[PDB]
RNA sequence: CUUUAAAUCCUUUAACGAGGAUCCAUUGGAGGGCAAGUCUGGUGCCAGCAGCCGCGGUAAUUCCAGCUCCAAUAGCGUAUAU
RNA sequence: CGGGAAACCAAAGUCUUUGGGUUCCGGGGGGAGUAUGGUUGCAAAGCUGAAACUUAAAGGAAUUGACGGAAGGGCACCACCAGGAGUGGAGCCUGCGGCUUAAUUUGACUCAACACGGGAAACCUCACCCGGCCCGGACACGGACAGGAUUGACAGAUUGAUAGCUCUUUCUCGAUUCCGUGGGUGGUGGUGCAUGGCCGUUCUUAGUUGGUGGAGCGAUUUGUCUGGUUAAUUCCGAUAACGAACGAGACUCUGGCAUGCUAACUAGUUACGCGACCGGUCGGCGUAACUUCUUAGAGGGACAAGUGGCGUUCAGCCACCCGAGAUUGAGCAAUAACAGGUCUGUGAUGCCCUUAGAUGUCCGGGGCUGCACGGCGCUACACUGACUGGCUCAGCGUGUGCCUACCCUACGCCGGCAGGCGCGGGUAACCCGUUGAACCCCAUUCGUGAUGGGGAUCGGGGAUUGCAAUUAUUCCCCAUGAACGAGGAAUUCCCAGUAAGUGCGGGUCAUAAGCUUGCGUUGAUUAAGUCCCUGCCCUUUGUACACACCGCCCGU
C-alpha cells in the first residue's frame, strides 16, 4: 500500500514549548530571605512518597505529573 | 583428471567461457 | 557417494542445488544403486536429510537420500521374522552320495 | 697514429668511463583461432574492443586503467599489392 | 563389388592405388540472368550478358525435438454425449465491469491470480486516508549539558471519551548523545531474474535412463517393438538385443465382513440375595466363564479345492448354477523442466540505505462496504411434501491455567425468553452427552395451486465476559405483498451412499463463518460410451520451425 502521508499537514502550527533551565531552585518554597527551609511545614506520614520531595506552590496546574494528582490543599 | 574445469564446462557447455574450458580440457 | 557405497547401502542419491558456478543456479545430483521414490517403503527403507551451506554467493542446499538393507542395524543377518521386502533366500541343495554302497561305520 | 686527394668510418694504442651497472627496450597482446589472468578498480548494450566468432544491458577473462604474464626483440604493429 | 556428406547409385563403381577418348559447363550468397551492347523476331520475347554496391553466410543430406485446419490407434466429467445442480435474475460473504481529499487489482498469458498469501484488518492489518503525547541511538571513539527536554480527567483563553499538537504555563524516581573499521535504528523493505528450502504446474497422463552388445563417419539409434491389446513401458509375446535402474503395481491408512479376544466398573450379562409378572431392576455390591451389538480397540481369511463364452486358448476380457466378500476412497508419487510462487514464515541466507510526529507507541472516524443472484455455499407452480397422536434412535471431533488472566459446560433463579448470578462436573468412552445430524401414521391440517415453495425484515420482556459493532457476534419469534412450473450470450462441477437438500463440528476465534476443512438418514434399469469439441499419449508422415506455429516468413 501507500506510505503514511503525514508530512504536509498542520500548517501554521508550532510544537508545545517547554522551558530549558539549568537548575531546579525556584521550584521549591524559597521565600526565607536566604532560600532555606523551615520546620513549620508538615511531612506526610506515608511511605509511598519520597523523603526528598517537599511541598511547593505553582501559580498553575501543580508541582506533579507522573501520577497527575494535585497535591495542593485547595 | 582435473575436475574444476570439467564442472565449469558442464554448468554451461556453450557459455562465454566454453571455448577456453574446452581448450583447457584438450591436451 | 563412495563412502555410502562402502558403507553397505544399496543406493544413494545426493543433490546440491543453488549457485555452484556463475550467477544462475544449477541443481546437480548424483545417484547410484537403487532408490524407491513412492509407496510406503520409503519411510522405513529410505533416509532423507536436507541441509543448507552458506557461500559468498549465497546458500547451497544439500539433499542426501540413502537406501537401507533388509535387516535392522545395517544388515547384521537374518533374525526373528519381521518381513519387510521381497527376497529369494536360496539354501544349499541336498547332495546324494556317488558310491553305490551306503555309509559304513 | 692508421685510413684517405684532404676527411670521416672501421681497426690500433692510450686517459677517463657501471650497482637502481638510472649507461633505466620497445611494440603488440592476454576468450577462442593463438602464447599468455573468469586478479583488482571504473564503466553499465554507454564509451569502446573486436581481421572472424563474439565481448559490453551494475560480480566484463574481451572495453578504460593498475598489477601480473608472453610473443618477437632493436625491433614491432598497421594499410595495401602479391 | 565399390563409391558417396548422406539420401542413395550395379553405377552416381573400377579416384591421393588420382591419366581409355571427347563436348558442354560451375567457382560463397545477393545484386541478376538485371543493365548495357550485339543479334534474332511482326510482336511477345529469345541467345550472348556485366559491374558498382551489399553480405557471413545462403545451401545439401541426415538426426532429435516441437508443430500440422496430415493420417492411424488409445485415454480424460479439470473433455464431450445423456442428464442433475448450477450463473452480475426473483436474498445472504466478497474477487475485475467504473477510480486522481489512496478509498481496494502486491499473485494473473488464465484455466498454474482473484473466500489465495490458511489475509474473517473494530488488536497497532501493508502502516492504511487523517490536529498521531513517541524515539524504537540504550552499536564504545567530530561538537556533547550535568533538564535529548522524556504528563495532563483537563470550565468559551489549555476549542476529542486518559493525544498541552493554538499562547516563553508545565511539574512525587529523572541524568539517560545525532555519528567514520561489520546486512544499525525495525531487521514485513527491495532483488523469488542471485539463491536455498518448501510448494504449484507440465503429471493423473505413463513415462524416463544407463552398462555390454548391434547399426551409422556422425548427430543419433536399437533395447524402449508388428500385434494382442491392460487403468498402466501392465503383461503376453515377436525380437540385434541381453541384462538392469526409476516410475506403474506391490506398499500404507481407510471403508454396510468375523461366534477366538482364557476381554472390558463406561455395554447387556448362565447357575448369587432383590424381583408384581405370562429363569429377568446380580447394567442400581461385583460374575472370577461372558461379548452379540460398543471398543473398527489387538491377533484373520475365502477368485479361482469354480462355471460358461470370446481370445493365437497365451496375456486377458464379458456373464454366472457347492458359494459373506468379485473396481472403497485417499497417501506416497519418476527423468527432465518453468527465469511459475514465496527474500512480507523463518536465527535460511548473497548484494543496501544515514539524520526527524521512521515502516515498530499514540489513527475518536475509517480502509475492498463509492455496487443490479446471463466467484463456493441458495427458490422444486408439489401426496416424493406437513407443527412431537412415532423416536428402547442411525452420528466426525474439541474442551481449564506450565509461560498467561482468556476452555467446554450440565443444573436452579432473575424468566413465558438474549443477557446476568450461584454452588457443580470435566485434563475427558468417566462431564457437557443417550451431542436436539429426518419426524415415517405425520391428532392448526391441501382444489383448478397470485396465498407454507419467500412470507421483496425493524416494531415489540429487554438489547454484549472485549477501548472501537456508523455495511455489523446485537438477540428466542409474528397475516397472501419483486419471483412463478428448474429463467441458454457464455462458464479453473459431477457416476454406487456422487449430484443435490439440511445441519453439526474443527482452523480463524478477547467478539465472531453464509470462508475453508471434515462429519451425518440417501441409488440404478447405469452411458458399462465416444474422440465431434477441449486436451493428453503412442506410431507413421511432412516441415524452410529450434526464441520451436504467440514460429518462420513474403510482397505493396
The Cα C34–Cα C45 span in angstroms is 11
* Fold (topology level) of C1-105: Ribosomal protein S3 C-terminal domain (3.30.1140)
Resolution (A): 2.8
* DSSP state at residue A23: -
Which of B11, B15, B17 should we substitute to test contact with C (largest number of C Cβ atoms within 10 Å)? B11
Task: Give, in Å, how far the C1' of E401 lies from the CA of A66.
Answer: 34
Inter-residue contact C12 to C33 (CB < 8 Å): yes
Cα C101 to Cα A41, C96, C97, C98, C104: the distances in Å are 136, 12, 9, 9, 9
Task: Give the dihedral sign, CA C29/C1/C38/C42.
Answer: negative
Cα of C70 to nearest chain B Cα, Å: 36
Inter-residue contact A65 to A58 (CB < 8 Å): no
This structure was determined by cryo-EM
Nearest to C10 by CA among C63, C39, C47, C43: C47
The Cα A42–Cα A54 span in angstroms is 10
Q: In what order do the strands lie in the sheet with C59-67?
A: C26-33, C11-18, C59-67, C46-54
User: C22–B12: do the CB atoms touch at under 8 Å?
Assistant: yes
Cα C84 to Cα C7, C13, C27: the distances in Å are 21, 22, 33
Cell of A47: 511511605
Cβ-based contacts of C21 with chain B (< 8 Å):
7-8, 11-12
Inter-residue contact C29 to C15 (CB < 8 Å): yes
Give the distance from CA A43 to its chain's centroid: 19
* Secondary structure (3-state) at A8: coil
Cβ contact C21 with chain D strand, < 7 A: yes
Q: Where are the alpha helices (DSSP H) in A1-74?
A: none
* Secondary structure (3-state) at B11: helix
SS3 readout for chain C: CHHHHHHCCCEEEEEEEECCCCCCCEEEEEEEECCCCCCCCCCCCEEEEEEEEECCCCEEEEEEEEECCCCHHHHCCCCCCCCCCCCCCCCCCCCCCCCCCCCCC
Nearest-5° Cα angle at C34, C65 to C30: 55
What are the domain boundaries of chain C?
1-105
Amino acid at each position: 500500500k501507500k506510505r503514511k502521508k503525514k508530512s504536509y499537514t498542520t500548517p501554521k502550527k508550532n510544537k508545545h514549548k517547554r522551558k530549558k533551565v539549568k537548575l531546579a531552585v525556584l521550584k521549591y518554597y524559597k521565600v526565607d530571605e536566604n532560600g532555606k527551609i523551615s520546620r513549620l511545614r508538615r511531612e506526610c506520614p506515608s511511605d509511598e512518597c519520597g523523603a526528598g520531595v517537599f511541598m511547593a506552590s505553582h501559580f498553575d496546574r501543580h508541582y506533579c505529573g507522573k501520577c497527575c494528582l494535585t497535591y495542593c490543599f485547595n | 583428471f582435473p575436475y574444476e574445469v570439467s564442472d565449469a564446462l558442464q554448468d554451461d557447455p556453450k557459455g562465454k567461457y566454453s571455448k577456453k574450458l574446452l581448450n583447457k580440457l584438450v591436451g | 557417494l563412495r563412502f555410502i557405497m562402502e558403507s553397505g547401502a544399496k543406493g544413494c542419491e545426493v543433490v546440491v542445488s543453488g549457485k555452484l558456478r556463475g550467477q544462475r543456479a544449477k541443481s546437480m545430483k548424483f545417484v547410484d544403486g537403487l532408490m524407491i521414490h513412492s509407496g510406503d517403503p520409503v519411510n522405513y527403507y529410505v533416509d532423507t536429510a536436507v541441509r543448507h551451506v552458506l557461500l559468498r554467493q549465497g546458500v547451497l542446499g544439500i539433499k542426501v537420500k540413502i537406501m537401507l538393507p533388509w535387516d535392522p542395524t545395517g544388515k547384521i543377518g537374518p533374525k526373528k521374522p519381521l518381513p519387510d521386502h521381497v527376497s529369494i533366500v536360496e539354501p544349499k541343495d541336498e547332495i546324494l552320495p556317488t558310491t553305490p554302497i551306503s555309509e559304513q561305520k
